């Protein structure tokens, strides 16, 4: 199994999620539609990014490594949508959304920038992202959880389930980044991509399926 193959697998998984979310939201009352649309965009954008990488585009040479630019474009656009989904579920107002969305953006921008910087100073960008990430986790586990507590028992339960999925799985990315080509380059590009393809699929499609389950049960 090579990079190309791993990218195709990611494209296929994202496509399956995209189609399922689009279908399940066919009707969608008039206030629940928002959730389905966000899911379609999250997995849809990732699907495109993976096909692009699978076709060999965006493989940017940096120092003695390769940076998959599409992955980062994908993250920058999709992770804020995931955060939006959680904030909607938690019942946040504009100001609340604004804070978590910017922290999220700082994480992804710093990571992309760090990956694109050849020198050892790139770790300074990585650190910036790590710090903003802790801020994001704080909001997810604190204020946003407090806000969610004002919703029905089911919604609060779905929020908690997805919050846990997000906090735990997202916290893993920085380590894979630090151990893979972007950092120490211990893990080969293939192993790093394999691990990240799984993580992207679960944080997006796994995330979506869990939500659909809750919606159905509700
Ligand atoms: C904290 C941290 C990171 C986190 C990345 C995450 C959490 C990515 C999630 C992607 C998803 C959910 C895609 C779909 C980076 C950028 C590796 C580097 C800086 C430190
Ligand atoms: Cl990369």
Curated annotation (Swiss-Prot):
Q: How does it assemble?
A: Homodimer. Interacts with HTR-II.
Q: Which Pfam families match?
A: Bac_rhodopsin
Q: Which UniProt keywords apply?
A: Cell membrane, Chromophore, Membrane, Photoreceptor protein, Receptor, Retinal protein, Sensory transduction, Transmembrane, Transmembrane helix
Q: Which residues cross the membrane?
A: 3-24, 33-54, 69-90, 94-116, 121-148, 153-180, 189-218
Task: State the CDD domains in the record.
Answer: 7tm_SRI_SRII (cd15029)
Predominant localisation class: membrane
Q: What is this protein called?
A: Sensory rhodopsin-2
Q: Is Membrane included in the keywords of this UniProt record?
A: yes
Into which family does the record put it? Belongs to the archaeal/bacterial/fungal opsin family.
Q: Which GO terms describe its cellular component?
A: plasma membrane
Protein localization: Cell membrane
């Amino acid at each position: 199994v090579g990079l190309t193959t791993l990218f195709w697998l990611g494209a296929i998984g994202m496509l399956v999620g995209t189609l399922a979310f689009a279908w399940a939201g066919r009707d969608a009352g008039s206030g629940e539609r928002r959730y389905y649309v966000t899911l379609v965009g999250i997995s849809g954008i990732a699907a495109v990014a993976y096909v692009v990488m699978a076709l060999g585009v965006g493989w940017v040479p940096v120092a003695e490594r390769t940076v998959f630019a599409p992955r980062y474009i994908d993250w920058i656009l999709t992770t804020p949508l995931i955060v939006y989904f959680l904030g909607l579920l938690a019942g946040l107002d504009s100001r609340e959304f604004g804070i978590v969305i910017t922290l999220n953006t700082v994480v992804m921008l710093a990571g992309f920038a760090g990956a694109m910087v050849p020198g050892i100073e790139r770790y300074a960008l990585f650190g910036m992202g790590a710090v903003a990430f802790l801020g994001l986790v704080y909001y997810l586990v604190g204020p946003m959880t407090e806000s969610a507590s004002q919703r029905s028992s089911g919604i609060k339960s779905l929020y908690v389930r997805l919050r846990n999925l997000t906090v735990i799985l997202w916290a893993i990315y920085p380590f894979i980044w630090l151990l893979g080509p972007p950092g120490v380059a211990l893990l080969t590009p293939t192993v790093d991509v394999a691990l990240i393809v799984y993580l992207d699929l679960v944080t997006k499609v796994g995330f979506g399926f869990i939500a659909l389950d809750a919606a159905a049960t509700l």
